[PDB]
């Protein structure tokens, strides 16, 4: 299947890697990325718990909310990391690590 | 004259659907079937045009419209069943409460 | 309906479709008069707008 | 095209004879299992019993109840009989021995299977008997339920072959018959064919003793005969599909010159005959399910397995690039 | 009347909480969704008054 | 203790368990084995 | 390969979350162990969270939504216009969901599938906004429509809800068939379904004497389908009956989100394609009919829900006046009108859902509400004066444009219709203020106080309605951005 | 001496994690 | 000629769908209209669509219509009306639609009139396309799941909505 | 080629004639069950699933892994629907 990563709007920052691999983007996760991940997951677990009290399923509701939050937070962190590696988001740390390795 | 003949086949089915709407003011099941006749005519249009233009896009859309027609019929008949179950009858005089 | 009624309605429909074939041939035969009439009506509009801008 | 009717008759007439004699063979094998003899008085070894029953049936007066659906009542057995006959136009008996070499023959067979429900539905409704109507509704539901599994199994075979041509499906089994790797698929296919032909242990219309009146309860004389003949012609066809899809059709058991001496039509016939024996052997062996039990089996057992086998076969062939 | 009033006034804190939750649980209903689920919710006996105090 | 819950689930519902296993192998092979074969071919 | 799907991250997330909620709901609603708990509010809260996470993913990934635009080109088209339209749609859906928990708990509407269908229709409208081909447009429209047919009939034992669903299915399937016939004519005549190809084929010619009648009628039928979708007269009569007969949260949802998504489609199809005058005259005549008929019919209504339905018909007439003029300011004003009407409608339906706990049905039921709940009567009066367009409330903004275009595109009959229908609308809106403040009924209805969700939403929307004209710069700038991004 | 409800304790941990994470999110952006 | 026969059969069968007193008969005439459509598709060389119209429209959709209509036992009085009064409105609507749409292609797709000369001798054959020809099935399957897979998946979402809505609207569990 | 369908038509006509000869020679001497609607719906859905599998099965050798996974996603959505139907008792006939 022929592919093309080229975006409509060009990256406004140094392009460290045009099409970074999945594991490379995951390994690029920063402290802020983990903070976003953890915040989304914790809020989602909390909403699951609180909305589960009335039907009596606070634990299962907690697991469901936590799964939704885990998927959403991982997707958000991946979004940010890959955008930094691709030059779409401000990527000072990516460029500093790239110019050295 | 091939293209005109296939086209008029589909067009007659479409007009028959329109007439079936026009002619069945007491028969809402036949109205649903008239809508299915119109949808069939449209599918035929897409397939005939796909052949006439040597283009595949008309066939892809014909298959997808098939999926849509099936979904529409399933939901439509479910609503018909619950309407009948509530009222005990399908007569149009029992589905005219909302007005103004 | 009776089966004979369905057969007769089919015969009538077959006649209708052959008549439609004749109509299609008639329309195909008069493409040139349509083209010649259109030549006039578009050129009248040209000679017209050109004259209306001379002033 | 002038000799096409000769070919069509050379298919249809021997098929009607083969069905007449399938009824006899069913009565003989069931009898022998039950330590009885079976029809052996009407003709030598009972071999004229089919002719006698057919002539008796055509000499019976038709009844034609006073229903508002006179035409549909007579048309329903015609419909089912025609559907059972027309599937054989695409069945290959040997290399080159087939009436229509359809490139879409698999989907055509599925479409005929799907049309088969209307004869039963219409017979049940047109009879003006609530027993017949209810029995018909249950039989139609069972048929459509097991058509899903039949279709998903067809997809498995198509994935292996990569073509809808029935002759191509047969010739793709030269290396190995598909019933060896897909033996569970063959088992599920044979069971789904029993349920689609309304045969034991799934024969609801036979369970009149069970307070279940069949869709053809009101029929007499030749309409009743046409229903029966369509059903039996469907059993030979389903035995022919089991043969074509999984037992390599007309191919010999082993690719050896001793086995290639007997023609392909004999191999095809013998495999068809094995499957027809099993249809009768099962009728003779087991009791029958209730309607709710076989419906549960259809949706909860055979749909999931068939779907899982599609996924597994496609995934295995895509992984190792063994696709056709 | 004295019987129902005496029964209510002598309940403990735990039973008061149990019956408050039950009362909230059975205050409204969705018999349509219940029929879809194929269940029949029954009023718990601790929320049912004896017939001798009912108006009929 | 989710180890006998799986055992009971297999005991009650063998057709579902078998379908999940068969389809799961069908999904596992292209997901895991196929990239291993593609990589082994690259080198 | 994986990075290509960064352009569909919001949709992937919302669809997967919808599946998770479907499974969670069906597993624990059938559980004997938990006594078959009603899960409508639980799944509602989890779905509101899912919508907010989708919104986060979409808004924080603005440049990434345009990645791999050539690979994704034959499927959809994401740009700034789609970006802002989708953000607004997600916000509408979140607000509507937050307005449903009291209805779930007090009527005991226990079906969690309600939330699942709302989320699936939100997916469908998200795909509608980015649609860039007739095929994709139709598919997304059908997905959204099927979800609405099912939720319109959700009260399955009610005569009204079953009647609403039946009329919706028949008139909706009819209109969809008409629209599909138009797509077939365009395809047959141009051999093209992609919006870019249709643009190239149709620009520069319009009606150049030898006009393709196939193209022209494909356009007409597609326009008829769109007009049915936006409830423009004469394709409107399904709307008041479905709005009344559907459960009130369904009515609130159908009032806002589908209009945003269908107007996005209309812009990207018509403003962008090129047949020209006829297309805009269609919308001009339908706008006039909508304004007049909506004003008169609303003046005749005695029930709150019907009055709101007819008011929405009139306002779509006012909005479509903007599409009729076919200029940058026309598109900007259409977008501004949509935004303000959506916020006002959300205010109005928050109040209606609050009063539905004591079963409000008639306008006369609001008698003496200024005594029993004075701050609610003020909030509702503000909404009615905003609907009537009295400055300096937000409703004036949209009214101001109507006359600006009428004197810009040179149309004084439109101006006269606007003056007369504005006066009629003012009358039937201030009739509610009279009922709540001036009347002294013998029998009063005392209403239960609203829950926190609706009070917070009402407070925010009411502050917006009273104070938007003080700081309107962001909406003006963003709508100008969207109008420009339609072409560049 | 000890809070027994485990699900309640996990919910408390999740709420604390969300609060500290939001604070860190602001502090590092 | 053959197209005239199929058109006439479809026209009569469609009239019988929209004009039959009994809705069961209407559903049955609808099956005949779909069979005729299948024949037209076979003429166009689209055998996959010809079979699928049989499998889906007749094998699945008409069956559902038949099950519902049959179990409803509609009485002819609840749905009967005389249709003589609609001949004028049907006449005007149908005539407008006829004159405008039966002839929409005529300006754009002008028919080639058959002459008394053998034009078959001017058919140019290009053998390169015939070396490995594609069926309708594999030509469609080359596109459905790769270049246009998103629409495929949206159609799956449509089917999911149908399943959910069918259960929610009608299920009464025993 | 569509040439191979003509024998099917002549076969149909002959089958019709045989049917009428056999059937004619002797002429010479109020309770709605929703479970049927539900089975119809299920059949329709899986009918469309078999329909979408036919092109996929013949095209697997060209579409490769992309086509395989798009079909798997399709199946996953429809199987979630099936699990919903299962848990709701639409597959039970007792
Ligand atoms: C109880 O099960 C049974 C039946 O009744 C349902 C049968 O159908 C039958 C009898 C029917 C048959 C299969 C006989 C073979 C079929 C035929 C070729 C036609 C049937 C009728 C005839 C033998 C006479 C043919 C006469 C004409 C109609 C004129 C045409 C020359 C059997 C064997 C039976 O035992």
XYZ file of C-alpha atoms in Angstrom, chain B:
100
model
C -29.419 3.560 -27.716
C -28.331 1.184 -24.965
C -27.586 3.809 -22.334
C -30.953 5.539 -22.754
C -32.814 2.226 -22.415
C -31.081 1.152 -19.186
C -31.512 4.683 -17.852
C -35.261 4.664 -18.598
C -35.587 1.281 -16.888
C -34.169 2.794 -13.707
C -36.186 5.984 -14.201
C -39.454 4.061 -14.470
C -38.665 2.318 -11.188
C -38.004 5.700 -9.551
C -41.268 7.147 -10.888
C -43.111 4.047 -9.684
C -41.778 4.713 -6.196
C -42.995 8.319 -6.401
C -46.442 7.206 -7.589
C -46.559 4.584 -4.852
C -46.061 7.335 -2.307
C -48.756 9.394 -4.040
C -51.260 6.522 -4.245
C -51.116 4.912 -0.791
C -52.223 7.507 1.761
C -53.857 4.804 3.904
C -51.084 2.234 3.415
C -47.823 3.221 5.122
C -46.189 -0.204 4.548
C -46.463 0.290 0.764
C -44.943 3.737 1.253
C -41.881 2.144 2.850
C -41.694 -0.310 -0.127
C -41.974 2.647 -2.578
C -38.961 4.220 -0.893
C -37.080 0.897 -1.333
C -38.035 0.976 -5.080
C -36.532 4.468 -5.386
C -33.348 3.285 -3.662
C -33.101 0.320 -6.037
C -33.469 2.640 -9.029
C -30.637 4.831 -7.726
C -28.387 1.785 -7.279
C -29.108 0.806 -10.876
C -28.192 4.319 -12.002
C -24.814 4.030 -10.291
C -24.044 0.626 -11.818
C -25.115 1.634 -15.342
C -23.046 4.831 -15.156
C -20.049 2.896 -13.840
C -20.211 0.681 -16.937
C -20.834 3.586 -19.318
C -17.877 5.631 -18.038
C -15.435 2.703 -17.520
C -15.120 3.876 -13.898
C -15.223 1.794 -10.717
C -16.509 4.458 -8.317
C -20.113 3.676 -9.242
C -19.730 0.057 -8.131
C -18.110 0.853 -4.767
C -20.961 3.219 -3.982
C -23.571 0.718 -5.175
C -22.313 -1.836 -2.646
C -22.294 0.731 0.163
C -25.816 1.930 -0.711
C -26.842 -1.731 -0.472
C -25.606 -1.803 3.121
C -27.502 1.423 3.836
C -30.735 0.129 2.282
C -30.603 -3.006 4.422
C -30.052 -0.961 7.592
C -32.885 1.429 6.701
C -35.313 -1.434 6.107
C -34.442 -3.163 9.384
C -34.933 0.009 11.423
C -38.041 1.053 9.469
C -39.836 -2.252 10.083
C -38.817 -2.190 13.797
C -40.534 1.235 14.132
C -43.562 -0.173 12.209
C -43.752 -3.126 14.680
C -43.626 -0.881 17.824
C -46.194 1.526 16.215
C -48.559 -1.442 15.582
C -47.875 -2.984 18.993
C -48.772 0.263 20.757
C -51.897 0.938 18.711
C -53.176 -2.503 17.721
C -53.682 -1.301 14.148
C -51.682 0.168 11.247
C -54.508 2.522 10.094
C -53.285 6.059 9.420
C -56.002 7.559 11.635
C -54.146 6.269 14.716
C -50.813 7.928 13.919
C -52.031 11.514 13.495
C -52.127 12.758 17.111
C -49.170 15.166 16.759
C -50.277 18.210 14.759
C -50.414 21.984 14.466
